[PDB]
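> call design_seq(struct)
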């Protein structure tokens, strides 16, 4: 009895050590501050990370539950050292909770970065579509595109202040100017 409890103790020690190792390596990836260079770069970062987050969560959780469950099994049937493995459980759960919270904030940071880059990419090409003019309802369909971009610019102003908020406001104004200038050209034809 004493012998196989000691045997399970050490075979739990190995697994927990390998889990705690594996967690530390995940967090190295999980904590890149990159955020992206241009709409393309960000698309890759976000897709790549969505995957990494999804996968690390599923696998990690299975592994951590197994270790928690086992540790409680050993405790319910009277193991000594229950005091020592209770500590191991707590120290594992903590590393894990930390990695999940860390993963999450980088999810949201890339979420935010994706949107901002998309906005400017949309604005960059909408201005191209304005020059793509200089029937007469194609303009009336760009008007829908511009209008959506303005709704986007409007929402983002809630999410930003200072240099970034102003930068956003600039492109929306530039675009609106450019669109109206087309409308002054357009109805002036009829």
């Amino acid at each position: 009895n004493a012998l196989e409890n000691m045997y399970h103790l050490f075979q739990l020690k190995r697994e927990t050590d390998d889990l705690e190792q594996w967690i530390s390596e995940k967090e190295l990836v999980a904590s890149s501050p990159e955020m992206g260079q241009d709409f393309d770069h960000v698309t890759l970062l976000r897709d790549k990370f969505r995957d990494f987050a999804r996968e690390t969560g599923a696998i990690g959780q299975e592994r951590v539950d197994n270790v928690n469950a086992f540790i409680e099994r050993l405790i319910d049937a009277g193991h000594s050292e229950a005091a020592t493995i209770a500590e191991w459980k707590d120290g594992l759960n903590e590393m894990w909770a930390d990695l999940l919270e860390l993963i999450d904030t980088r999810m949201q940071l890339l979420a935010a970065s994706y949107d901002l880059h998309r906005y400017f990419y949309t604005g960059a090409e909408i201005l191209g579509l304005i020059d793509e003019k200089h029937f007469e309802r194609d303009v009336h369909l760009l008007g829908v595109q511009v209008q959506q971009f303005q709704d986007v610019a409007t929402r983002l102003q809630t999410a930003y202040a200072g240099e970034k908020a102003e930068a956003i406001q600039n492109k929306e104004q530039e675009v609106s100017a450019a669109w109206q200038a087309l409308l002054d050209a357009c109805a002036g034809r009829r």
